[PDB]
Amino acid sequence: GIPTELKPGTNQFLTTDDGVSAPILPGFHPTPPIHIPGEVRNLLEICRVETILEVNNLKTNETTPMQRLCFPVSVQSKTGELCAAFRADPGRDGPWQSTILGQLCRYYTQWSGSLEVTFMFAGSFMATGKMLIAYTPPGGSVPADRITAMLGTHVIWDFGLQSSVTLVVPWISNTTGIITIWYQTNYVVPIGAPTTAYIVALAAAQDNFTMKLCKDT
Amino acid sequence: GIPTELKPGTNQFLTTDDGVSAPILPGFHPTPPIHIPGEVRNLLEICRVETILEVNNLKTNETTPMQRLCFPVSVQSKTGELCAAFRADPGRDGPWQSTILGQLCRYYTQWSGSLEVTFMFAGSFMATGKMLIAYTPPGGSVPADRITAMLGTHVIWDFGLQSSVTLVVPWISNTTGIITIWYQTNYVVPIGAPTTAYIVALAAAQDNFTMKLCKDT
Amino acid sequence: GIPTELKPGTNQFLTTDDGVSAPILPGFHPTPPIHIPGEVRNLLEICRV
Amino acid sequence: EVQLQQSGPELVKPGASVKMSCKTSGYTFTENTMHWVRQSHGKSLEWIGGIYPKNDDTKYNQKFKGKATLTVDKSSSTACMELRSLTSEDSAVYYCARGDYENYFYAMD
Amino acid sequence: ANIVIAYGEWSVNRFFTLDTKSWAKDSKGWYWKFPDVLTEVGVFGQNAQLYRSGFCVHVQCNASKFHQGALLVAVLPEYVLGPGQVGAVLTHPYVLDAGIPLSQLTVCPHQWINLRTNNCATIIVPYMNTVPFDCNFGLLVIPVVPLDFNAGATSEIPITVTIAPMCAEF
Amino acid sequence: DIQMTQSPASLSVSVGETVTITCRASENIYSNLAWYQQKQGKSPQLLVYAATNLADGVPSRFSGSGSGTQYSLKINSLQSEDFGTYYCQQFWDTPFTFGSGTKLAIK
Amino acid sequence: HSTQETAIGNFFSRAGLVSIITMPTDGYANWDIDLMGYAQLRRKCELFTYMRFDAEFTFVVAKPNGELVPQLLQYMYVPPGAPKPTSRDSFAWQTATNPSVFVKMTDPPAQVSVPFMSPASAYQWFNMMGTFSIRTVGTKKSPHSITLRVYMRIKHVRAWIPRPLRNQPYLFKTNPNDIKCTSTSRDKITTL
Amino acid sequence: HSTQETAIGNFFSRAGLVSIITMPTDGYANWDIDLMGYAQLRRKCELFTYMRFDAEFTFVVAKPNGELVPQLLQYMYVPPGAPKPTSRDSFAWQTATNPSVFVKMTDPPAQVSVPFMSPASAYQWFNMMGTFSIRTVGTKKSPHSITLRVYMRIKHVRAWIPRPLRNQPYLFKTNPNDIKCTSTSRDKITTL
């Protein structure tokens, strides 16, 4: 026979080692598979679908989690007030824990890419007004008022015509950004129409978003 | 020599493992085989031959098993009476335990396919009459009378001309059907001819019948 | 190295097993054979006389 | 002081059943186990079975598999035993003994 | 075209006629063991005292149209229990005295004899053995349906068996 | 199945002598053996368990020994309160088969 | 980074401990095959509905203290529907249709593979692959405590119908039965 | 489903236990080769008359308690017609025409193969392949109890002449000798 000597690493079991074992039943023929709609080749497909974040998170809303989905806007708010401000880190606990992206980022350590945030206006049809959506670059400071947040990345959202926009976060890394919603014009309502509206926030990952170094939690 | 390390699974014996052993006698020449009629390549050939079921199964026939083979038909029976009714599951104990198909299905767990049932009339030549052979689809109910069994799968068997027919069970699965024999016309007999006849039931598996997951009993 | 697992039948000695052993003297050259009359290829030749 | 009090003897018609129960006191019931021993005539001893009331799991002798049936009540701290299909030779003496701590070994005191 | 070929493939030449068995209502069954039962018949009488031959057997029953019944004829290679032209009688036709049930007897080559539409049946079987030159196979004829007839008719129905050996090499 | 018997059938030992009693087992338990004292009309109690350690209420006169399949119980000396019978115990496997029993007398 | 690490195959690829079996001074332990045994590997499979996967098993035997003894053990697989052994001397251990793996403690851990056992095209989580049986060979007890652990990998992963994850903690084993918020809180809306 | 599982080859393929040999504190045990030893694998072969098969054998040695001891044993095959050994020191063990397999208890089970031994073209069930011999090497007794089990597979299955199965239970070993109905019963004909 061909002479050989056992090298170090014999008689061991490695959990990440991919071997080829011996089938218990050599003559068993399994049921042939059929085409099943909704097939997923990679976890990137699950991260690209839009899901609802929680911007309304508060100690008072613990009893009624249904109000956590949306945040109110009313006629009482004046020009220049800050409606909502939240940091976006997919991994950390917060508004991003409810989305499917933040949950899939818990099984992984290093993730990076670009993100997207979508808003929806469920208010009355005859209501009109403008909303300032600003994003502070990572490492900056919180905008003090409306005029200091216009110098950075911003988009004007007017629900009198366009009901939704897409804010693209340029870059994120974990080895964060500041999304603030400012009041531009006061909420305009006619007679008989509701004086309080709700806005639902959605988010989805882009194609350049990558992940690695699997770690269980 | 070529260095190698023993992977997990060394020094074990698997009952389903197909190896190549060392012949005890290296120079022994066995007797060369010759052509033997009646060769069987697969167990499907044994299931396709027709065999006799037991429809006459009763507590009284235990002393004389010879009467179990056939079931009587007489002039006393009127129109609309149920001659015989039996479920067909090849595996379960019952009329299908006597056939070679039911015995081969005992060594296997999952079997499916189509079946066939054949009847034979051993009665007198000058006798005439009609017989209703009905099959209830799996999951239905037992037919109450003759008129409710005609709506389903049925065949008219008249032994005045055709002495046998083939009833094909469309589908069976194990993860049953109802075969009933109803009286259509009364048994017609002339003078001097026997007033009681016997009918023998035969059954055979079809080509689409498959079996797997061998389990001993 | 190429991973492998020992199948049943390792560390045994079979009397009818034909192997290839290691020569004790690697450099010894035996005497070359010469043609010897009366050679027998098979025991059938002895039975036919 | 550990004390186990049994019931009184009964007269059973052959073919009927019997209810045997003996209360336990002086210790904690559920942490330990219970056993039964039959003394056949004239002099012999045989181990009927045992019950450990944490699951409850039990083990019986091969011959008593189809006769003896055991159950326990942890509210009154008692142990019960049922015997069915009594025959003429089934007359014997039964004992109530407490076993080890989650163990059937360590011979009963 | 009722010729039944076994297993799908194929002064010495003449028709040997055995005895005619009387088959009544209370009967059970008969069986013959080839070649042994044929060794005392005709030219083979002094021949048997190696043989390679195929066997062609004919089973004919003469009965009127007023009777009723059915028989079963089959060829079982190496049939061992657990004999002259008279044959023998099975004491337990259900197990055929083999301990083997009668319902599965149809696995072997067979032809149904029904007194209604057919008065005769035949089975052509070749020689099957591990050694080509040598109780090869028995012939089992047993009624599935017993005889029933009105009083005044003939109570005995003769059953004849004729042996016609084909391709005989001695 | 596990099976064991004692030897001999019965003994007679007066007060103040040595009692040698043995019970042999077919298989080897290696560990556990117990002895029980059962008088007339009363229930047994534990004396010596695991062939070595003795239970409460038992004096130093009772001492066990033996290893493997050969065990013994040495009683030195005998007292007038020791009258009764002895048994043996095996924890090796279920079900447990007890001893045959041996009766004591006074010479 | 490439797409190979986030792929469906590498997400179920890493091995895990699916069972813990301990034999005191019983003799045989029957363990049913389940992937729902522990919290890990459970939440991951509820992300999907239909799943088709081959099963790879690993048999690791040891004592409570860790030392190895030259004792021979038997590892048998019981297909679905086959009767379970009631004891060590029973008939189920001599059954020919139940495969067996004879390994010792000095023998490095054996690896067996179970093909797809379901009659359907894929498993439905919202699943019985059969059960095992393990005993020490011989008609007598073995004076050694055996504590073994079974490792299970997943080969040839196929996925369908992605489902939303379950935020609430699990109650029972066979059913997904005081509601808890899926995210943390903060005192105000404008606070970071 | 495919036709590969129901094929004649895969029906006899699975291994089984054909023997149980126990040596008390004798020294040698001679066991004759028979496939009729147990109920399983017996009823299966009576379905057919002529059968041609190679034989694969497995020698597994252990103690009653299961622990392994470094003791050397001898496994010898005796062809049909050869004399059987009458003792351990006899001449049959030094015979050159009787093959031997030298294995230890730590040595994993050896596997030997027996070709077709019959002078005819196929076996007739309605069959002696020879006998074995096993002893412990040395001129002195070995202070260890040896209990071994032999596993037997079947390679290159060939079948002829399908026969009806035997419904009645077996009586003796060499002959297929109170008749029992092959099926269950019911109180009426029209009842389900």
Numbering used by the authors:
A (entry chain C), B (entry chain C): 1 to 175, 191 to 232
C (entry chain C): 1 to 49
D (entry chain F): 1 to 109
E (entry chain B): 29 to 38, 59 to 97, 101 to 133, 153 to 204, 210 to 245
F (entry chain E): 1 to 107
G (entry chain A), H (entry chain A): 73 to 97, 104 to 204, 228 to 278, 283 to 297
Quote from the publication.
Coxsackievirus A16 (CVA16), a member of the Enterovirus genus within the Picornaviridae family, is one of the major causative agents of hand, foot and mouth disease (HFMD) prevalent in infants and young children. Specifically, CVA16 utilizes cell surface heparan sulfate (HS) glycosaminoglycans as its attachment receptor, and human scavenger receptor B2 (SCARB2, also known as lysosomal integral membrane protein 2, LIMP-2) as its uncoating receptor. Cryo-EM studies show that 9B5 and 8C4 target distinct epitopes located at the 5-fold and 3-fold protrusions of CVA16 capsids, respectively, and exhibit differential binding preference to three forms of naturally occurring CVA16 particles.
From the same CVA16–9B5 dataset, we obtained three cryo-EM maps in distinct conformations namely C1, C2, and C3, at the resolution of 2.90, 3.35, and 3.80 Å and population distribution of 29.3%, 37.2%, and 33.5%, respectively. The channels at the two-fold axes are closed in C1 and C2 maps; while that in C3 is open, which is a typic structural feature of expanded enteroviral particles. Additionally, the VP1 hydrophobic pocket in C1 and C2 capsids is filled with a pocket factor, which functions to stabilize viral particles, but the VP1 pocket is empty and collapsed in the C3 capsid. Moreover, the central sections of the CVA16–9B5 maps revealed that the density corresponding to viral RNA genome is present inside the C1 capsid shell but absent in C2 and C3 capsids. Taken together, these data suggested: (1) the viral particle in C1 is in the native/compact state, similar to that of mature CVA16 virion; (2) the viral particle in C2 resembles the compact empty particle/procapsid; (3) the viral particle in C3 probably adopts the expanded empty particle configuration. The C2 is most similar to the compact empty particle (RMSD 1.16 Å), while C3 is similar to the expanded empty particle (RMSD 1.24 Å). In all of the CVA16–9B5 maps, 9B5 Fab binds to the five-fold vertex, with each CVA16 protomer bound with a Fab.
